[PDB]
Design a protein around this ligand. Structure first.
Ligand SMILES: O=C(O)c1ccccc1Nc1cccc(Br)c1
Length: 193
């Protein structure tokens, strides 16, 4: 599972609408040494090197996606849950060639539902840099070319309790493109050092 005692990821999806086409989808555990991907993020130190230290270690995950890119409004929807009432700050960073080219910060208040609190960040428009990048990627003639380009791209999502500034979740995402027969797939991993 992608989560901790305090906050669990319940659903994540990135999609385009004219039904939906889902690039990646998670609906709800091997490990990986941080040092394996250190170079994929910067050392602003707003890439992982400085942030993992501050801790706690159990809040850090790596997700690998095999995206389905064979298919307007481009969106992202995420939903988390917890037993405690918080306000969440969600920082999302896109890193390209070791540099941070996007940072998106959003804030979501708890909603009471069925004896738990849910945090619904629904249909957040995908930022324009990504829509444009996807359009280009979509142009490439071969999948191995898409994957060459994507090896230089990573996303980091940091979720923090806004009122205390405690880190609840830190997730790194890396991407490849699957073949259409093989739909999208993900694998979630713990990060350790
Ligand atoms: O949706 C956005 O605008 C965004 C901005 C910064 C980092 C990630 C973002 N969305 C996104 C898009 C596809 C997969 C994943 Br994980 C996240």
């Amino acid at each position: 599972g992608l989560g901790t005692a305090r906050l669990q990821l319940v659903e994540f999806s990135a999609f385009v609408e004219p039904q939906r086409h889902l690039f990646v989808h998670i609906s709800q555990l091997e490990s990986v040494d941080v040092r394996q991907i250190y170079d994929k993020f910067p050392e602003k130190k707003g890439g992982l090197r400085e942030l993992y230290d501050r801790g706690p270690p159990h809040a850090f995950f790596l997700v690998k996606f095999w995206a389905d890119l064979n298919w307007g409004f481009y969106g992202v929807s995420s939903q988390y849950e917890s037993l405690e009432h918080m306000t969440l700050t969600c920082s999302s960073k896109v890193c390209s060639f070791g540099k941070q080219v996007v940072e998106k910060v959003e804030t979501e208040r708890a909603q009471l539902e069925d004896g738990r609190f849910v945090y619904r960040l629904l249909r957040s428009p995908m930022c324009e840099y990504l829509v444009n990048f996807l359009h280009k990627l979509r142009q490439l003639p071969e999948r191995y070319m898409m994957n060459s380009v994507l090896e230089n791209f990573t996303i980091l999502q940091v979720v923090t309790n806004r009122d205390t500034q405690e880190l609840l979740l830190c997730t790194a995402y890396v991407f490849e493109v699957s073949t259409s027969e093989r739909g999208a797939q993900h694998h979630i991993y713990r990060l350790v050092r």
